[PDB]
């Protein structure tokens, strides 16, 4: 169910991404709320597109983890932690990660264009 | 910065596509303006999707350049010209190009479907 995995581990919660994805979209004040909700949804979809993740819910990238953002083990993050705790721990680093993801995709797009240009 | 490449060459400006892409989305009269802005954004995303470019900012296609649209050299277009000048020079040919891109993607989708049908 919607948000039922919120208290579950990140691993267990990663298997229910479509439930929340479906639920995100599902006078003047209500029109403003609906237009803003659409704009937010589209901003998140645009941001995924910029990263090359436009059609994926689980999207792997070419940006390495710095370890300064979090030096936890994979078992500590995926088995012993929830998504709310993880989001809180790295709330100060999401703009750095987003910037790196955008730069990495821009480099990937240029590399793909150049590879396609080889006769 | 947003539109900072407007006076730069097409090549130099092609490296800043995410700045404008991010900035495009970022009572009654304002709701109409916001709904129309969303509809325009979605029309451009739908048009890219029709061409098979739904997740790309730089999307290569299978439509050849006719040379009647513009007989300029690549250095004349990418090194000695801006995007505003280029857009003005081919403003009378964008519907032909869009039609060819749509037809080419429709053919590609049928070919992919038939290739996937080979056991």
């Amino acid at each position: 169910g919607f948000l039922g995995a919120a208290g579950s581990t990140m691993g267990a919660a990663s298997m229910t991404l479509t439930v929340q994805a479906r639920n995100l979209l599902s006078g003047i004040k209500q029109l403003q709320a609906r237009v803003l909700a659409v704009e937010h949804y589209l901003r998140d979809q645009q941001l995924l597109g910029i990263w090359g993740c436009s059609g994926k819910l689980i999207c792997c990238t070419n940006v390495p983890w710095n370890s300064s953002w979090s030096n936890r083990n994979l078992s500590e993050i995926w088995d012993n932690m929830t998504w709310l705790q993880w989001d809180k721990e790295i709330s100060n680093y999401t703009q750095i990660i987003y910037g790196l993801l955008e730069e990495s995709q821009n480099q990937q797009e240029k590399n793909e264009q150049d590879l396609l240009a080889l006769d | 910065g947003f539109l900072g490449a407007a006076g730069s060459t097409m090549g130099a400006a092609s490296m800043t596509l995410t700045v404008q892409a991010r900035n495009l989305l970022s009572g009654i009269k304002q709701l109409q303006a916001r709904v129309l802005a969303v509809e325009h954004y979605l029309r451009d995303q739908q048009l890219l999707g029709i061409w098979g470019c739904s997740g790309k900012l730089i999307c290569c296609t299978n439509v050849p350049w006719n040379s009647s649209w513009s007989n300029r050299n690549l250095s004349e277009i990418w090194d000695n010209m801006t995007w505003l000048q280029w857009d003005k020079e081919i403003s009378n040919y964008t519907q032909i190009i869009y039609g060819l891109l749509e037809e080419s993607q429709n053919q590609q989708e049928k070919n992919e479907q038939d290739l996937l049908a080979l056991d």
Epitope: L116, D119 | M10, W78
Partner: antibody, heavy 123, light 106 residues
Framework: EVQLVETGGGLVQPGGSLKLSCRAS????????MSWVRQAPGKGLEWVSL????????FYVDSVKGRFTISRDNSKNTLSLQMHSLRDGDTAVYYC??????????????????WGQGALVTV | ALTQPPSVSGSPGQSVTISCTGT?????????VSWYQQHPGKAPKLMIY???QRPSGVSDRFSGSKSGNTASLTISGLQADDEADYYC???????????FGGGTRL
Amino acid sequence: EVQLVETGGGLVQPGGSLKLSCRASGYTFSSFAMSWVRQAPGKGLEWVSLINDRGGLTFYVDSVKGRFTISRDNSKNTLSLQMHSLRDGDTAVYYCATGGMSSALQSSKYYFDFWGQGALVTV
Amino acid sequence: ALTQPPSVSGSPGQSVTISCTGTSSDIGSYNYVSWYQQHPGKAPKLMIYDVTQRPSGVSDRFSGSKSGNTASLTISGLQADDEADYYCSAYAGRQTFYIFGGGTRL
């Protein structure tokens, strides 16, 4: 004019490692793709490796894919090559070449525009 | 590799033909067969790029052509200063970028 000047090692025992560094001037380094081309003392020339103008893409001959790494620093106007496991068949003069590729928005190359003088790598 | 005769010669002032034959995946399908002139002890210089085009600084005595899977270089007005080893280089796709021929001594 355009000049490419090789710096490198000499005799290295079989199975070791050697790195070449090629300086270039007279043109914008970051605007051209670079290649390394090898010529054995008694043979003609063969292509060894190709790097893009930005350095993101590298290509190698199958026989050297696991031994040679090509890299470029566009701020230092320097093209370097590093090779490991130097086999007896790899002794040759290694020439820097400008050209061999272009990044889609430029006219086609698929040829080498400029050549250096060549470093001699022996075993 | 591409195959060309190991030796070419002629009287000064006369034309000579140098040619190399490859396969359909090397010379035939791609119109990118360049030619280089290498003097002993010197690095090769670019003489011809593309099938028929010449770089700036090279005289018009050097002219390229292609037919079928065979590429040729015609050198008219042969000079004593042209006695150099000539090589052809063909683009052969994405897996095999360049294939060079053996040299011919003029």
